[PDB]
UniProtKB/Swiss-Prot annotation, chains A, B, C:
This is Major capsid protein. Interacts with the decoration protein; each hexon binds a single copy of the decoration protein. Interacts with the portal protein. It is found in: Virion. The chain holds residues 170 to 458 of 458 of the full protein. Major capsid protein that self-associates to form 120 hexamers and 11 pentamers, building the T=13 icosahedral capsid which about 860 Angstroms in diameter. Responsible for its self-assembly into a procapsid. The phage does not need to encode a separate scaffolfing protein because its capsid protein contains the delta domain that carries that function. The capsid gains its final stability through the reorganization of the subunits that takes place upon expansion. DNA encapsidation through the portal triggers capsid expansion and the binding of the decoration protein to the capsid exterior. The gene is D20. Transmembrane segments: none annotated. Changing Y184C: Confers resistance to Pycsar-mediated defense, reduced fitness compared to wild-type phage. Changing S159P: Confers resistance to Pycsar-mediated defense, reduced fitness compared to wild-type phage.
Length: 289, 289, 289
């Protein structure tokens, strides 16, 4: 029964460390059931939470006001499988000497691809990657870094970032920056630490990454191209939208033959990631020029 | 059925979850029953009690001696509702248990709004804003620290007020400091340790607040404006002044229809916030101007 | 008599403890029992076999997708010889137990050789060693130190090599620094300890390797050849790079003759160092360059 049902109820426990890789791999889990879970509902957007039941009934104007929100929350993943195989038909002598050994790895690059696409995705097949949202959140903000040539990615930069988001965001609570390595490359190994960067070690407090640019322990991760023109910087409020419609129980399907003298194990995934607004990130930019 | 009246005390123990929002909420017990509780007392703000029996009631100077008081101790609350939809209609395709998938959110932001209103409010409908309460007694001791950038009082004025109100308040009964994360970047990322400060664990034996200098386990959490002028500290005897005069358990109101492809949610919360005497609270400042 | 079986238990338990000599090597040991574990796959080097299976998997380059990746992962370990008879003519004096002194130091230098061989080894009969496995990748980098003159060498080295380890694992898991005490003579009695060099216990905290560099902890001692041109360092994530593919160990034959009457304790051992990737480590360098 090698590569049947004897281990596959535990590689998902490995995925219980893979999704626990903090490139950003939880905003909020949205457990589910069907194909799509839809709510047409209008989120806490335009508030009005409590009223005192007392003074001015919305005090004239505007009505709704700004959305709202309708879009909707027809929320839906894809099969984001990282289906694998080996040839079992080789190791066929009561082995069982591979059993985490051939995994913890599948589950890795599985998740690595997952957050890779979470920079480098869309909605197609994989959901949104944020560089797609970067180029379209109307905050490709230019020209920040001249980048890879006569550069000063400072924090007046990041001040324009934060004062181009805290609008739609809240203010420094929580809100996140997500960057490149090249960001915390040359904006570390320096005394800048511009208003801040360096490092704010801090350890422990909360989720704890690298840097603490205004306390924000940043996401390098980076699935960018360097090449001067991308983002490094991704200023956005973590605790707003950008939620994770992660759906279901993962069923790797250790199918057998399938010829080629091999056996094939269908490292599934059905999760998704999605927002709640018109806007989202502040995007670079940190451009060719 | 569903949002009709059934998941009920559910949302009350959810309110038990963010009763534990750790900012002002840990206060003094009060299941009211009338509209406004009114007590009467010329309170702890003047007398000077007890007799030396033979020796006397202190003749000419003085006897009244000031005010007083004849205010008196009426306890005036309002209500926190929560008005928002959920479509309890198109979604009927067999989940409903989906209520926990849908809920909390509003009761969350409800409570968020609640304690931010405690920081920021006007007295009316929400109670009085904590910085406003810092403003009206001029707990603003401008400008101890100065305008967001090399800002200079560690616990210095805090020890000044650990003598000033720390006097009709005391020392570590209760004594707290709500701060900013701008302020957390000041006096955490710290080396001192004045009494306690570093790193803000700090011994422990507290109540759960982020950082601790001296023996004041500290609120950061921060619901003011940052920017140069706010009170980035909050030196208040957290056991004397400012009780919550609550009313009841918050009742939720699962009215359904309320027509036209939607429904009707109300979550009537009547806790409050009220003090007694003059001033058992300082704060900041730390000031632009 | 002695020189025989009743020793071996009380001998291999001594081996069961310097088993834990951790003085360079400690991984997750692949156990074996046959001979070769040979695995017929290409590891993590782009697959990550993600699927939409749905949209369009970019019909151009390349497929697999890059070099290579099957080595193949063969694993027949290495029979490790130590050997030393004793005064095998004189526990006819029934000493039972001078060997509690008289043994174990054989396990001492035995394991001394083991770990040296492990981190400095040719490939053959052992497997490979660290600076040796450093020594074909051009991880000999340039020119962070300069011929042991102006050797005040900090962590900029470690910064850009940390960015080299900004790689495909994480940050600081594991990411280490098997070092030299002359490499410590750079950054012991440094005034910096810039990021961190010292105390690196720092409490004590991690394995037994105190001194850390952002958590890059310390293994010095009699491995690095000096005069600048070996590494000062061993910047390797212990996780992704390497495991131990061991099988057996001590099944020492305490054979007898061996002339002038002494007992051939023909000492056995079988463990392994072997890798997967292209790169697992850059280190130093720290060169005469």
């Amino acid at each position: 029964s090698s590569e049947s049902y004897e281990t596959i109820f535990s590689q998902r426990i490995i995925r219980d460390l893979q999704k626990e890789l903090v490139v950003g791999a939880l905003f909020e889990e949205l457990p589910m059931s069907s194909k799509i879970l839809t709510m047409l509902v209008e989120p806490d957007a335009g508030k009005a939470t409590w009223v005192a039941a007392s003074t001015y009934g919305t005090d004239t104007t505007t009505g709704e006001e700004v959305k709202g929100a309708l879009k909707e929350i027809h929320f839906s993943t894809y099969k984001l499988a990282a289906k694998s195989f080996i040839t079992d038909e080789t190791e066929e002598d009561a082995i069982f000497s591979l059993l985490p050994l051939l995994r913890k790895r599948l589950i890795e690059a599985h998740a690595v691809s997952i957050e890779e696409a979470f920079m480098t995705g869309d909605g197609s097949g994989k959901p949104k990657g944020l560089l797609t949202l970067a180029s379209e959140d109307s905050a490709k903000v230019v020209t920040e870094a001249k980048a890879d040539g006569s550069v000063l990615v400072t924090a007046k930069t990041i001040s324009k970032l934060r004062r181009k988001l805290g609008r739609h965001g809240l203010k420094l609570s929580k809100l996140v920056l997500i960057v490149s390595m090249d960001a915390y490359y040359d904006l570390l190994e320096d005394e800048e630490w511009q208003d801040v960067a360096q490092v704010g070690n801090d350890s422990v407090k909360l989720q704890g990454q690298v840097g603490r640019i205004y306390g924000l322990p940043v996401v390098v991760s980076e699935y960018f191209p360097a090449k001067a023109n991308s983002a490094e910087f991704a200023v956005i409020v973590y605790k707003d939208n950008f939620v994770m419609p992660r759906q279901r129980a993962v069923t790797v399907e250790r199918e057998r033959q399938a010829g080629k003298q091999r056996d094939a194990y269908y490292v599934t995934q059905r999760v998704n990631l999605q927002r709640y607004f018109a806007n989202g990130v502040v995007s670079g930019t940190y451009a060719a020029s």
